[PDB]
mmCIF file of C-alpha atoms and ligand atoms in Angstrom:
data_model
loop_
_atom_site.group_PDB
_atom_site.id
_atom_site.type_symbol
_atom_site.label_atom_id
_atom_site.label_comp_id
_atom_site.label_asym_id
_atom_site.label_seq_id
_atom_site.Cartn_x
_atom_site.Cartn_y
_atom_site.Cartn_z
ATOM 1 C CA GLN B 1 -24.787 -25.496 58.545
ATOM 2 C CA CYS B 2 -23.823 -22.593 60.921
ATOM 3 C CA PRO B 3 -23.015 -19.914 60.095
ATOM 4 C CA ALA B 4 -24.636 -19.759 56.468
ATOM 5 C CA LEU B 5 -26.139 -17.439 54.189
ATOM 6 C CA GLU B 6 -28.147 -18.110 50.844
ATOM 7 C CA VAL B 7 -30.310 -15.897 48.560
ATOM 8 C CA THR B 8 -32.759 -17.417 46.032
ATOM 9 C CA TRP B 9 -34.702 -15.426 43.254
ATOM 10 C CA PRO B 10 -37.374 -16.495 40.696
ATOM 11 C CA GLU B 11 -36.224 -19.051 38.046
ATOM 12 C CA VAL B 12 -38.392 -17.742 35.370
ATOM 13 C CA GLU B 13 -37.429 -14.536 34.253
ATOM 14 C CA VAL B 14 -39.889 -11.700 35.226
ATOM 15 C CA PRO B 15 -41.183 -9.049 32.522
ATOM 16 C CA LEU B 16 -40.660 -5.515 32.494
ATOM 17 C CA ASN B 17 -42.897 -4.066 35.201
ATOM 18 C CA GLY B 18 -43.465 -7.359 36.924
ATOM 19 C CA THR B 19 -43.391 -8.236 40.287
ATOM 20 C CA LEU B 20 -40.762 -10.434 42.344
ATOM 21 C CA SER B 21 -39.400 -11.398 45.440
ATOM 22 C CA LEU B 22 -35.707 -12.490 46.383
ATOM 23 C CA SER B 23 -35.643 -14.529 49.737
ATOM 24 C CA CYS B 24 -32.550 -14.528 52.180
ATOM 25 C CA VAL B 25 -31.980 -17.241 54.469
ATOM 26 C CA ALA B 26 -29.165 -17.191 57.271
ATOM 27 C CA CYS B 27 -27.817 -19.067 60.188
ATOM 28 C CA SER B 28 -25.639 -17.312 62.964
ATOM 29 C CA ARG B 29 -24.651 -18.907 66.301
ATOM 30 C CA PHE B 30 -25.524 -15.970 68.026
ATOM 31 C CA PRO B 31 -29.270 -15.796 68.893
ATOM 32 C CA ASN B 32 -29.106 -12.358 69.999
ATOM 33 C CA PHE B 33 -26.497 -10.509 68.379
ATOM 34 C CA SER B 34 -27.164 -11.213 64.665
ATOM 35 C CA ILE B 35 -28.895 -9.225 62.203
ATOM 36 C CA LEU B 36 -29.992 -9.600 58.443
ATOM 37 C CA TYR B 37 -30.543 -6.911 55.880
ATOM 38 C CA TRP B 38 -30.533 -5.996 52.379
ATOM 39 C CA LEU B 39 -28.529 -3.208 50.573
ATOM 40 C CA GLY B 40 -29.108 -2.459 46.889
ATOM 41 C CA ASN B 41 -25.974 -0.571 45.420
ATOM 42 C CA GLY B 42 -24.630 -0.364 48.639
ATOM 43 C CA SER B 43 -27.778 1.360 49.974
ATOM 44 C CA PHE B 44 -30.171 0.762 52.593
ATOM 45 C CA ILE B 45 -33.598 -0.469 51.010
ATOM 46 C CA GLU B 46 -35.752 2.493 52.143
ATOM 47 C CA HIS B 47 -33.057 4.961 50.564
ATOM 48 C CA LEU B 48 -33.666 3.491 47.021
ATOM 49 C CA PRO B 49 -36.136 5.400 44.522
ATOM 50 C CA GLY B 50 -38.731 2.798 43.197
ATOM 51 C CA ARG B 51 -41.496 0.596 44.692
ATOM 52 C CA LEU B 52 -39.593 -2.000 46.736
ATOM 53 C CA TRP B 53 -39.288 -2.931 50.402
ATOM 54 C CA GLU B 54 -37.926 -5.659 52.949
ATOM 55 C CA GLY B 55 -40.031 -7.593 55.384
ATOM 56 C CA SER B 56 -39.370 -8.118 59.014
ATOM 57 C CA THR B 57 -36.342 -10.616 59.871
ATOM 58 C CA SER B 58 -38.027 -13.850 61.200
ATOM 59 C CA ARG B 59 -35.766 -15.546 63.703
ATOM 60 C CA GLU B 60 -36.172 -19.212 64.660
ATOM 61 C CA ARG B 61 -33.939 -20.871 67.377
ATOM 62 C CA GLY B 62 -32.966 -24.374 65.994
ATOM 63 C CA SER B 63 -30.437 -27.107 66.805
ATOM 64 C CA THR B 64 -27.656 -25.985 64.542
ATOM 65 C CA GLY B 65 -27.738 -22.141 65.711
ATOM 66 C CA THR B 66 -30.497 -19.652 64.756
ATOM 67 C CA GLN B 67 -32.146 -19.257 61.693
ATOM 68 C CA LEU B 68 -32.712 -15.307 60.301
ATOM 69 C CA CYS B 69 -35.180 -14.769 57.113
ATOM 70 C CA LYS B 70 -35.943 -11.569 55.282
ATOM 71 C CA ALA B 71 -37.510 -11.161 52.051
ATOM 72 C CA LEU B 72 -36.846 -8.384 49.469
ATOM 73 C CA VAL B 73 -39.951 -7.620 47.357
ATOM 74 C CA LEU B 74 -39.801 -5.813 44.222
ATOM 75 C CA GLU B 75 -43.254 -4.247 43.245
ATOM 76 C CA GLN B 76 -42.233 -2.904 39.723
ATOM 77 C CA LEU B 77 -39.321 -4.572 38.276
ATOM 78 C CA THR B 78 -37.813 -1.438 36.415
ATOM 79 C CA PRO B 79 -34.532 -1.344 34.296
ATOM 80 C CA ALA B 80 -32.931 0.136 37.274
ATOM 81 C CA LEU B 81 -33.975 -2.555 39.823
ATOM 82 C CA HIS B 82 -33.171 -5.174 37.130
ATOM 83 C CA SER B 83 -29.551 -3.841 36.992
ATOM 84 C CA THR B 84 -29.250 -3.423 40.819
ATOM 85 C CA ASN B 85 -26.777 -5.333 42.817
ATOM 86 C CA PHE B 86 -28.861 -6.553 45.601
ATOM 87 C CA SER B 87 -27.009 -7.625 48.535
ATOM 88 C CA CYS B 88 -28.027 -9.686 51.695
ATOM 89 C CA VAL B 89 -25.973 -9.010 54.559
ATOM 90 C CA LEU B 90 -25.790 -11.119 57.742
ATOM 91 C CA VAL B 91 -23.860 -9.685 60.618
ATOM 92 C CA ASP B 92 -22.874 -11.145 64.067
ATOM 93 C CA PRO B 93 -19.891 -10.503 66.179
ATOM 94 C CA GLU B 94 -18.020 -13.068 64.432
ATOM 95 C CA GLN B 95 -18.094 -12.447 60.970
ATOM 96 C CA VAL B 96 -19.881 -10.694 58.007
ATOM 97 C CA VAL B 97 -21.229 -12.527 55.484
ATOM 98 C CA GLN B 98 -22.790 -11.113 52.064
ATOM 99 C CA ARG B 99 -24.557 -12.658 49.090
ATOM 100 C CA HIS B 100 -25.184 -10.685 45.810
ATOM 101 C CA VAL B 101 -27.573 -10.804 43.170
ATOM 102 C CA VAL B 102 -27.729 -9.013 39.932
ATOM 103 C CA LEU B 103 -31.166 -9.938 38.158
ATOM 104 C CA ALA B 104 -29.854 -9.199 34.632
ATOM 105 C CA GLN B 105 -26.762 -11.246 35.226
ATOM 106 C CA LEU B 106 -28.774 -14.296 36.668
ATOM 107 C CA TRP B 107 -31.327 -14.147 33.697
ATOM 108 C CA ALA B 108 -28.649 -13.347 31.014
ATOM 109 C CA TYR J 1 -23.891 5.408 57.600
ATOM 110 C CA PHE J 2 -25.470 3.222 59.994
ATOM 111 C CA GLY J 3 -29.279 2.652 60.760
ATOM 112 C CA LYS J 4 -30.608 1.469 64.123
ATOM 113 C CA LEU J 5 -32.157 -1.793 64.342
ATOM 114 C CA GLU J 6 -33.137 -3.665 67.676
ATOM 115 C CA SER J 7 -31.795 -3.128 71.123
ATOM 116 C CA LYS J 8 -30.512 -5.586 73.739
ATOM 117 C CA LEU J 9 -30.604 -5.069 77.436
ATOM 118 C CA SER J 10 -27.312 -6.172 78.699
ATOM 119 C CA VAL J 11 -25.400 -6.434 81.850
ATOM 120 C CA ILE J 12 -21.631 -6.258 80.858
ATOM 121 C CA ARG J 13 -18.995 -7.675 83.202
ATOM 122 C CA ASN J 14 -15.430 -7.614 83.010
ATOM 123 C CA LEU J 15 -12.710 -10.558 83.484
ATOM 124 C CA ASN J 16 -13.140 -10.362 87.439
ATOM 125 C CA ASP J 17 -16.748 -10.819 86.847
ATOM 126 C CA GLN J 18 -17.568 -7.142 87.994
ATOM 127 C CA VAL J 19 -20.494 -5.235 86.490
ATOM 128 C CA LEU J 20 -20.183 -2.124 84.565
ATOM 129 C CA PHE J 21 -22.033 1.002 85.865
ATOM 130 C CA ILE J 22 -22.462 4.511 85.187
ATOM 131 C CA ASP J 23 -21.219 6.500 88.430
ATOM 132 C CA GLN J 24 -22.259 9.603 89.738
ATOM 133 C CA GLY J 25 -20.071 11.588 87.509
ATOM 134 C CA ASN J 26 -20.742 9.698 84.332
ATOM 135 C CA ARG J 27 -17.633 7.720 84.575
ATOM 136 C CA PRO J 28 -17.871 4.328 83.346
ATOM 137 C CA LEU J 29 -16.751 1.897 86.350
ATOM 138 C CA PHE J 30 -16.856 -1.691 87.114
ATOM 139 C CA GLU J 31 -18.295 -2.969 90.696
ATOM 140 C CA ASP J 32 -18.620 -6.502 92.647
ATOM 141 C CA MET J 33 -21.732 -8.169 92.497
ATOM 142 C CA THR J 34 -23.560 -11.364 93.409
ATOM 143 C CA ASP J 35 -25.955 -13.119 90.857
ATOM 144 C CA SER J 36 -28.884 -13.650 93.533
ATOM 145 C CA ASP J 37 -30.847 -10.356 94.269
ATOM 146 C CA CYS J 38 -32.108 -8.126 91.595
ATOM 147 C CA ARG J 39 -32.439 -5.229 93.840
ATOM 148 C CA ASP J 40 -28.707 -5.388 93.299
ATOM 149 C CA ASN J 41 -29.017 -5.300 89.582
ATOM 150 C CA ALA J 42 -29.575 -1.333 89.621
ATOM 151 C CA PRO J 43 -30.855 0.850 86.800
ATOM 152 C CA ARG J 44 -27.249 2.308 86.202
ATOM 153 C CA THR J 45 -25.908 -1.136 85.520
ATOM 154 C CA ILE J 46 -28.677 -2.216 82.945
ATOM 155 C CA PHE J 47 -27.063 -1.440 79.522
ATOM 156 C CA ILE J 48 -28.944 -1.034 76.193
ATOM 157 C CA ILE J 49 -26.809 -2.332 73.555
ATOM 158 C CA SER J 50 -28.378 -1.070 70.151
ATOM 159 C CA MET J 51 -27.318 -2.828 66.753
ATOM 160 C CA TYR J 52 -26.988 -0.959 63.618
ATOM 161 C CA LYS J 53 -26.890 -2.195 59.974
ATOM 162 C CA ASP J 54 -24.265 -0.501 57.955
ATOM 163 C CA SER J 55 -23.887 0.667 54.380
ATOM 164 C CA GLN J 56 -20.138 -0.514 54.329
ATOM 165 C CA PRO J 57 -20.528 -4.051 56.137
ATOM 166 C CA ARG J 58 -17.570 -4.292 58.577
ATOM 167 C CA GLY J 59 -18.685 -5.893 62.019
ATOM 168 C CA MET J 60 -21.572 -5.746 64.452
ATOM 169 C CA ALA J 61 -21.814 -1.997 64.813
ATOM 170 C CA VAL J 62 -23.470 -1.160 68.352
ATOM 171 C CA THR J 63 -24.149 1.917 70.766
ATOM 172 C CA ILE J 64 -24.043 1.408 74.489
ATOM 173 C CA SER J 65 -26.615 3.409 76.254
ATOM 174 C CA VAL J 66 -28.324 3.529 79.841
ATOM 175 C CA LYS J 67 -31.703 4.518 81.257
ATOM 176 C CA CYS J 68 -31.388 6.881 84.187
ATOM 177 C CA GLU J 69 -33.481 10.118 84.695
ATOM 178 C CA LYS J 70 -32.365 10.802 81.048
ATOM 179 C CA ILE J 71 -30.619 8.250 78.644
ATOM 180 C CA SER J 72 -26.718 8.329 78.385
ATOM 181 C CA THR J 73 -24.468 6.864 75.777
ATOM 182 C CA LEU J 74 -21.039 5.710 75.756
ATOM 183 C CA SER J 75 -18.610 7.799 73.459
ATOM 184 C CA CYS J 76 -14.763 7.577 73.153
ATOM 185 C CA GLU J 77 -14.383 11.170 71.752
ATOM 186 C CA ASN J 78 -10.769 12.032 71.989
ATOM 187 C CA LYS J 79 -10.017 8.634 72.994
ATOM 188 C CA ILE J 80 -11.316 9.234 76.285
ATOM 189 C CA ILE J 81 -14.283 6.896 77.471
ATOM 190 C CA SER J 82 -17.368 9.135 78.827
ATOM 191 C CA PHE J 83 -20.975 9.202 79.076
ATOM 192 C CA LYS J 84 -22.734 11.661 76.841
ATOM 193 C CA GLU J 85 -26.396 12.665 77.677
ATOM 194 C CA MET J 86 -28.083 11.616 74.293
ATOM 195 C CA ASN J 87 -30.132 9.098 72.851
ATOM 196 C CA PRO J 88 -28.730 6.704 70.337
ATOM 197 C CA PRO J 89 -29.822 8.143 67.034
ATOM 198 C CA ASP J 90 -31.976 6.155 64.279
ATOM 199 C CA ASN J 91 -29.144 7.316 61.768
ATOM 200 C CA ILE J 92 -25.507 8.396 61.594
ATOM 201 C CA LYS J 93 -24.359 9.671 58.151
ATOM 202 C CA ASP J 94 -20.716 8.839 58.777
ATOM 203 C CA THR J 95 -18.786 5.599 58.278
ATOM 204 C CA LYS J 96 -17.443 6.088 61.628
ATOM 205 C CA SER J 97 -18.557 7.515 64.910
ATOM 206 C CA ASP J 98 -17.205 8.009 68.650
ATOM 207 C CA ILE J 99 -20.479 6.252 69.812
ATOM 208 C CA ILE J 100 -20.189 3.253 67.217
ATOM 209 C CA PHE J 101 -18.318 0.324 68.458
ATOM 210 C CA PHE J 102 -17.686 -3.010 66.800
ATOM 211 C CA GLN J 103 -18.691 -5.654 68.831
ATOM 212 C CA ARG J 104 -16.547 -8.751 68.061
ATOM 213 C CA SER J 105 -16.218 -12.287 69.560
ATOM 214 C CA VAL J 106 -13.128 -13.449 71.214
ATOM 215 C CA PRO J 107 -11.740 -15.984 68.934
ATOM 216 C CA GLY J 108 -10.626 -18.710 71.532
ATOM 217 C CA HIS J 109 -13.054 -17.812 74.268
ATOM 218 C CA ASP J 110 -16.549 -18.325 72.584
ATOM 219 C CA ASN J 111 -18.859 -16.547 74.988
ATOM 220 C CA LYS J 112 -16.584 -13.153 75.452
ATOM 221 C CA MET J 113 -16.746 -10.028 73.488
ATOM 222 C CA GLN J 114 -14.344 -7.078 72.941
ATOM 223 C CA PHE J 115 -15.453 -3.654 71.693
ATOM 224 C CA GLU J 116 -13.441 -1.984 68.860
ATOM 225 C CA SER J 117 -13.637 1.897 68.499
ATOM 226 C CA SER J 118 -15.039 2.626 64.901
ATOM 227 C CA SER J 119 -13.572 6.055 65.075
ATOM 228 C CA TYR J 120 -9.964 4.797 66.403
ATOM 229 C CA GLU J 121 -9.332 1.342 64.338
ATOM 230 C CA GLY J 122 -7.368 -0.937 66.386
ATOM 231 C CA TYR J 123 -8.492 0.664 69.768
ATOM 232 C CA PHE J 124 -10.572 -1.183 72.478
ATOM 233 C CA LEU J 125 -12.497 -0.797 75.492
ATOM 234 C CA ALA J 126 -10.403 -2.053 78.263
ATOM 235 C CA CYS J 127 -10.732 -2.364 82.236
ATOM 236 C CA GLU J 128 -7.925 -1.124 84.274
ATOM 237 C CA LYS J 129 -7.307 -0.504 87.946
ATOM 238 C CA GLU J 130 -6.527 2.839 89.173
ATOM 239 C CA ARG J 131 -6.605 3.810 92.972
ATOM 240 C CA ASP J 132 -9.551 1.736 94.281
ATOM 241 C CA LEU J 133 -11.336 2.340 90.766
ATOM 242 C CA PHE J 134 -11.878 -0.537 88.118
ATOM 243 C CA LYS J 135 -12.388 1.930 84.908
ATOM 244 C CA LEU J 136 -13.676 1.641 81.519
ATOM 245 C CA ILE J 137 -10.878 2.918 79.079
ATOM 246 C CA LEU J 138 -9.736 3.110 75.459
ATOM 247 C CA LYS J 139 -6.650 1.050 74.716
ATOM 248 C CA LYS J 140 -4.695 0.345 71.760
ATOM 249 C CA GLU J 141 -4.222 -3.589 71.132
ATOM 250 C CA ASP J 142 -0.771 -4.622 72.102
ATOM 251 C CA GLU J 143 -0.863 -7.924 73.433
ATOM 252 C CA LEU J 144 -2.307 -11.324 72.063
ATOM 253 C CA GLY J 145 -5.071 -12.901 74.113
ATOM 254 C CA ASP J 146 -5.232 -9.532 76.402
ATOM 255 C CA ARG J 147 -7.751 -10.388 79.010
ATOM 256 C CA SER J 148 -8.391 -6.462 80.227
ATOM 257 C CA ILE J 149 -10.312 -5.943 76.757
ATOM 258 C CA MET J 150 -12.605 -9.218 77.035
ATOM 259 C CA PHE J 151 -16.157 -8.854 78.500
ATOM 260 C CA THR J 152 -19.157 -10.996 78.896
ATOM 261 C CA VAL J 153 -22.290 -9.641 77.842
ATOM 262 C CA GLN J 154 -25.314 -11.089 79.721
ATOM 263 C CA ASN J 155 -28.769 -10.695 78.248
ATOM 264 C CA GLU J 156 -31.535 -9.315 80.616
ATOM 265 C CA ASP J 157 -34.594 -9.244 78.499
HETATM 266 C C1 LIG F 201 -43.588 0.385 32.557
HETATM 267 O O1 LIG F 201 -43.735 1.325 33.412
HETATM 268 C C2 LIG F 201 -43.343 2.519 33.259
HETATM 269 C C3 LIG F 201 -43.375 3.426 34.316
HETATM 270 O O2 LIG F 201 -44.797 3.800 34.774
HETATM 271 C C4 LIG F 201 -43.800 3.210 31.954
HETATM 272 O O3 LIG F 201 -43.036 4.260 31.416
HETATM 273 C C5 LIG F 201 -44.045 2.064 31.061
HETATM 274 O O4 LIG F 201 -44.759 2.539 29.839
HETATM 275 C C6 LIG F 201 -44.466 0.708 31.293
HETATM 276 N N1 LIG F 201 -44.376 -0.337 30.181
HETATM 277 C C7 LIG F 201 -45.568 -0.950 29.798
HETATM 278 C C8 LIG F 201 -45.149 -1.873 28.692
HETATM 279 O O5 LIG F 201 -46.844 -0.513 30.238
HETATM 280 C C1 LIG F 202 -27.887 0.466 40.785
HETATM 281 O O1 LIG F 202 -26.685 0.360 40.032
HETATM 282 C C2 LIG F 202 -26.686 0.257 38.617
HETATM 283 C C3 LIG F 202 -25.439 0.646 38.199
HETATM 284 O O2 LIG F 202 -24.911 1.877 38.141
HETATM 285 C C4 LIG F 202 -27.714 1.092 38.246
HETATM 286 O O3 LIG F 202 -28.026 0.639 36.793
HETATM 287 C C5 LIG F 202 -29.159 1.131 38.877
HETATM 288 O O4 LIG F 202 -30.211 2.491 38.425
HETATM 289 C C6 LIG F 202 -28.788 1.330 40.479
HETATM 290 N N1 LIG F 202 -30.243 1.252 41.139
HETATM 291 C C7 LIG F 202 -30.750 2.125 41.506
HETATM 292 C C8 LIG F 202 -31.948 2.001 42.264
HETATM 293 O O5 LIG F 202 -30.348 3.430 41.640
HETATM 294 C C1 LIG F 203 -22.072 -6.341 43.929
HETATM 295 O O1 LIG F 203 -21.445 -5.797 45.135
HETATM 296 C C2 LIG F 203 -20.381 -6.446 45.957
HETATM 297 C C3 LIG F 203 -19.878 -5.316 47.093
HETATM 298 O O2 LIG F 203 -19.386 -5.787 48.087
HETATM 299 C C4 LIG F 203 -19.294 -6.727 44.901
HETATM 300 O O3 LIG F 203 -18.431 -7.332 45.812
HETATM 301 C C5 LIG F 203 -19.632 -7.443 43.777
HETATM 302 O O4 LIG F 203 -18.468 -7.973 43.081
HETATM 303 C C6 LIG F 203 -20.766 -6.705 43.148
HETATM 304 N N1 LIG F 203 -21.075 -7.517 41.894
HETATM 305 C C7 LIG F 203 -21.476 -6.760 40.595
HETATM 306 C C8 LIG F 203 -21.841 -7.542 39.638
HETATM 307 O O5 LIG F 203 -21.053 -5.498 40.528
#
């Protein structure tokens, strides 16, 4: 339950220059001091070449802790993004948690 | 490198329930205060804790700032704790910074926090008495369960 972090991806392989989104869902016991953000090859998303972006971290206070959600949207699936080590990062004062996804591996 | 995200207005209290404040000489000190009247909760006691995302994730990286006539930010330059007249920046190109602390949960005290310097690994913000002052200093960790480096952060937003 909490803490927790899970990344989901499309089951069906996306063709070259296709579109897709990656879902990152976390839980943190810290309602205020917790963040969620994506990295690609260790870089902020807004620093990467290509057509991609992350949405806002939505936050919902449940009974197990606080759920954080953030989408990474890939507008055009190029070879470079297909081979990128995307990483969803949850951070709060107790721990750092990461989950990594490389599309080329997942579909291989 | 760091990028700034959201900020939380915060009253920071030491182990004796005294409140952090920025004094007339930019010294970080602590003072007694009651929880009943907010005219007591003066501008110099209302801190802005800004969270940063990190390219090398290692902890809850934060700056601690306060809004008076001008904005001031806590620094540990040269291992001394001071307030610099500057706004916390949107980006920091380094992996460490004299204004970036890692805010860490105290493992056996669920609602308490410690602040570790990113510049000086193993050094923490701490409260120490000198004369009639209760000072915020930087201390190398030397004692398990040291209560002098533990703080309560009360959200005020
Ligand atoms: C995919 O997009 C790239 C860049 O615009 C282009 O070089 C390539 O021809 C495109 N592929 C197809 C099948 O159109
Ligand atoms: C991510 O790293 C891989 C491996 O070096 C590379 O193939 C890919 O182009 C990188 N992605 C970007 C956006 O640079
Ligand atoms: C992706 O990046 C992380 C860096 O934290 C690393 O631990 C992981 O093994 C990487 N995966 C691949 C396939 O490179």
